[PDB]
Subunit: 237 residues, 4 copies
C-alpha cells in the first residue's frame, strides 16, 4: 500500500473506527485512526484556513484550523517523519463523501519545504502557491472526481452544475513535483502547507472531510476509499 | 520542433553561423543565431554566476554573467514572451561539446515565476533552489549525457572519472514541474533564474557552452544538437 | 531639500504645472513635473492595486495600477537610480487633499529590496509586508495627518468620524528601517513595492492623490506641500 | 531592566553561576542561568552555523549549532514568548570577552518574522538577510565595541589590527526596525534566525561567547556585563 502521513479535517463521526462523537481535526500516521485529534466547530458554508507545520529539530507535526472571528482548533503529534516517509514524496489534498455529502472546495493552497545541509552547509527548497486554479492545471495531478476551473477553485469531490454535492465521491490533487522531504546529511528539514476551503452541506450532517497528505510519489486513490477513509486508506486498520 | 527561448553562455565562435569572433552571451528566440550578443571573458576553471530576469511590464529579457573580481557582461532584448512561448513550459539547463570540449558543471540553480491576476487580483508562484544535487534527483528530468551526484554537482556533459571532458557530448536538466509562465488575465508575469557554473578546458579553445532555456513541456534534445547547437536547436537557421 | 523619486497616482489635473487633462499615473524624478505619465481611469470608492518594479540591469522604473476586471495603466522611465538616490534611503507612501478631497486609504503594502553580487555565492535583502496596520505600528514613522488602526488600514489624509475626507490635509508613512538601495560592488540591485488603496470622493471632483516614494533617510513633509505637491515637494519647479 | 530572551553559544564554563563544565548552547529566559543547555564541541577558528526557530503553535524555542562534517548540538525549551516578551522587540547579536578572549566574528545573519491570522486571507511579515556588512551599515545599531566593514564581517568584540582579540570587550548589533513578535489576534506567530560565526582563540582557553537575543526596543548594554554576562544581563541572578 501507499505510505500516508495526513492531517484530516474530519466532518463525520465514525465512532465504530475510533472517531470521537463530534467534527474533529487529526494527525494520521499510516492509519485513518488518528494518533491525535481535537474538537473542531466546522462552519457549514464558511471559508476556513488550515496551516500545517513540521521541523526536524522539534520532530512535531502541528495543524491549526480557524475561521474568521472564531476560536482555532490545533493538534500536535511528536513524530520523526525520517522514520515513516520515503526521502522523496508527493504532497496533496484529498476529500470524500459517502452516504452523507458536502462540497470539498479548495480556494487556495501553498506549500514550502527546505533542507539545510551538514555535509555542504547549503540549502535546497521548493515553494508553490495557487490563489487561483485554472481549467488546465498542468502542475497538479488530479485523481478520482477532482476538477479545477469552476470559479478558479479546486473541487475535490463531485458537485452538480447548480452546486449540489454528490455522495460516494472521492478525489485528490497532488503537486506534479516530487519533494525531497528529508536527508540524513541535513541540520534542519522543515515544511509548511496552507489551504483555504469551503465545506457546504444541504444536510444537518455533512461528510466526510478533507486532508492534506504526504505519500510515496506514485500514490493513487486506494480502492473503496470513499466515505470514512477520505481517499487515503484502503481500510480502517 | 520544440519552441525555445534561451540565454546562451557561448564559449566557441562559429562565425559561419552569425557568432562573433570571441566568447559571448546571447538571447536566443527560436534560433541559435542570437537576436542580441555581448562579449564575455569566460574564465577557464573559475566558478561563474548567471542571473536571468523577465517581467511582462518591461517585456525585456535580460542576463548578467559575472565572476568574482571581474567586470560583468549583460545582454537585453525586448521581446513579448506571451507571443513566443506556450502558457505552460519547462525550464532547463543545456550544454554541448563538439570537436572541442569543456566541463559544463552546474554547482547551484534557482528559479522563481509569479502571476499577479487582473480577473481575481491574486498571485500564483513557483520557486525551486538546488545548492546541492544528489545521485537520485527525482525533481529533475535528465536527458542526453547529463548526470548528478559527482561532488553534489550537475554534470551537463560527459566527464571521465579523473575529470576529463568528452567531445560530441550533449546534455540537459529540466525542472520536473511545468511552469505557468504567462496568463492573459494577469497584471505582471515575471520570472528569474540563477545558476553557478564551472567551465574548465585542458584546451586553449573550449566549446561549446551552457544555456538556460524555456520550452514546450515535452521538449527533448533535438537530433544532431551536439557542438554549436548547444542541445537546443535541430539546425543553425 | 529632500531627494525624492516617486510614482504618483494623481487624481486631480493641475494643468498649470504640467499635469495632463485627466487622472494619470506618473514617474517623478526630483520634481512634481512627471518625466512620464499615462491616462488612469481611477474608480471612485473601489479597491485598486499598485505594482512598482526596478532592476539595476535594465535601469527601468515601471508601475502598473489596476482594478478588478479593468484595463491596467502602466508607466515606465529609463533612469539609473544610483545617479539620483543616495546609497541609503527610506521608502514611503504620501497623499494630499487641497480645495478638493478624497480618502487616501491604504489596505496593504509590501516591499522587497535585494543586492546580489559576486563576493562568492551570497546576497543582501530586506522584505516587509503589511496586510493590516494597528493603532501603534512601531515599524512605521507617521508624518502630518497620517494615522493607523482604523479598520486595520493606513489613512494617509484626515477623515472625520462619520467617513468624510478633509481638505488641505497631507500625511506620509515611512518604513522605519533604512534600505541599502544601491551598492557599486553589486551585479544586480532590484526592488518591488505593491499596495492596495481605496480612493473615495463625496462628489465627482476628487484630489489630490497617492504616491509611493523613495527619499533620503531624514525626509519629512516639506512646507506648503498640500494639494498638488502630494507631500513630496516644496515647490512645483 | 531590559527584558531578554536569548540563545547562548557559551565557550567558557562559569560553574559558580550554573554553567555546565564544558562549552555549551543554552536558552536564556530573563536570566544568564540557562533554563536548558546542551554540550557543544566548539571548533577553534572554524566557521559554524546557528539556526533558531520559534512558532506560537508548539510554543517551542529551538536552536541547532553545527560545523561542516560534525554532529550538531541542539537545545529546546517550551515557553510562550507572549508571557515573556512585549508585543514589539528588537533582535540582535551580542558577544563578550573577560580574563579570556576570542574573535566573535559574524559572517552572515538572516531573520524572518510572520503573523498570520484570520481577518481574511492576509498575513504580516518582516525578513532581512546580511551576507556581507559594510563600514556604514545604517539598518544596524552597533553598541559597545561592535564594528562592521572589516572583510565584510560584523566584529562583535574588539580585535587589534594584527588579528588578536582583546579581553574585557563587549559589543552588540541590533536590527534597526522594531519587530511585531506576537499579536493576540493571530493564529500562527513564528520567527527564524540564522547566523554564521568564526570564534578564534590564541590559546586553548577561549571566552565568553555569542548570543542571538530578542529584547525591548530601547535595550542597551547593561553596566559591568563583560565576560560571563555576554552583554545581555546586569547580574547573574
Ligand atoms: O480654484 C482655484 N484653484 C484650484 C484649486 O487648487 C487647490 O486645490 C487643488 C485640488 O485639491 C490643489 O491641487 C491645489 O494645490 C490647491 O490647493 C483658484 C481660483 C482663484 C484664485 N484667485 C485668488 C485671487 N484671484 C483673482 C483675482 C482677480 C482676477 C481678475 O481680476 N480677473 C479679471 C479678468 O482678467 C483679465 O483681464 C484683466 C484686465 O484686463 C487682465 O489683467 C488679465 O490678464 C485677464 O485678461 C482673477 C482672479 C483668483 C486662486 C485659486
Ligand atoms: O580567575 C579568576 N576568575 C576567572 C576569570 O573570570 C573572568 O574572565 C572570564 C572569562 O573571560 C569571565 O567569564 C568572567 O566574567 C571574568 O571576567 C579570579 C581569581 C581570583 C580572584 N580573587 C580576587 C581576590 N582573591 C582572593 C583572595 C584571598 C584568598 C585566600 O586568602 N585564600 C586562602 C585559602 O582559603 C581557605 O582558607 C581560609 C582561611 O581558613 C578560608 O577563609 C577560606 O574559606 C578557604 O578555606 C583567595 C582569593 C581571588 C578573582 C577572580
Ligand atoms: Ca470520520
Ligand atoms: Ca558558438
Ligand atoms: Ca495633480
Ligand atoms: Ca559562561
Ligand atoms: Mn477521524
Ligand atoms: Mn552564439
Ligand atoms: Mn501629475
Ligand atoms: Mn552558559
Amino acid at each position: 500500500a501507499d505510505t500516508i502521513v495526513a492531517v484530516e479535517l474530519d466532518t463525520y463521526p465514525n465512532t465504530d473506527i475510533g472517531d470521537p462523537s463530534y467534527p474533529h481535526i487529526g494527525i494520521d500516521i499510516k492509519s485513518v485512526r488518528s494518533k491525535k485529534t481535537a474538537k473542531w466547530n466546522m462552519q457549514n458554508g464558511k471559508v476556513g484556513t488550515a496551516h500545517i507545520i513540521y521541523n526536524s529539530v522539534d520532530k512535531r507535526l502541528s495543524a491549526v484550523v480557524s475561521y474568521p472571528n472564531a476560536d482555532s482548533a490545533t493538534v500536535s503529534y511528536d513524530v520523526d517523519l525520517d522514520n515513516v516517509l520515503p526521502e522523496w514524496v508527493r504532497v496533496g489534498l484529498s476529500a470524500s463523501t459517502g452516504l452523507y455529502k458536502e462540497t470539498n472546495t479548495i480556494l487556495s493552497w501553498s506549500f514550502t519545504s527546505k533542507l539545510k545541509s551538514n555535509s555542504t552547509h547549503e540549502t535546497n527548497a521548493l515553494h508553490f502557491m495557487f490563489n487561483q486554479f485554472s481549467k488546465d492545471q498542468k502542475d497538479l495531478i488530479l485523481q478520482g472526481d477532482a476538477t479545477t476551473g469552476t470559479d478558479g477553485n479546486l473541487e475535490l469531490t463531485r458537485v452538480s452544475s447548480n452546486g449540489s454535492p454528490q455522495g460516494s465521491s472521492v478525489g485528490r490533487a497532488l503537486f506534479y513535483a516530487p519533494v525531497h522531504i528529508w536527508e540524513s546529511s541535513a541540520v534542519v528539514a522543515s515544511f509548511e502547507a496552507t489551504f483555504t476551503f469551503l465545506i457546504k452541506s444541504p444536510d444537518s450532517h455533512p461528510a466526510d472531510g478533507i486532508a492534506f497528505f504526504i505519500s510515496n510519489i506514485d500514490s493513487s486513490i486506494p480502492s473503496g476509499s470513499t466515505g470514512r477513509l477520505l481517499g487515503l486508506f484502503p481500510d480502517a486498520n
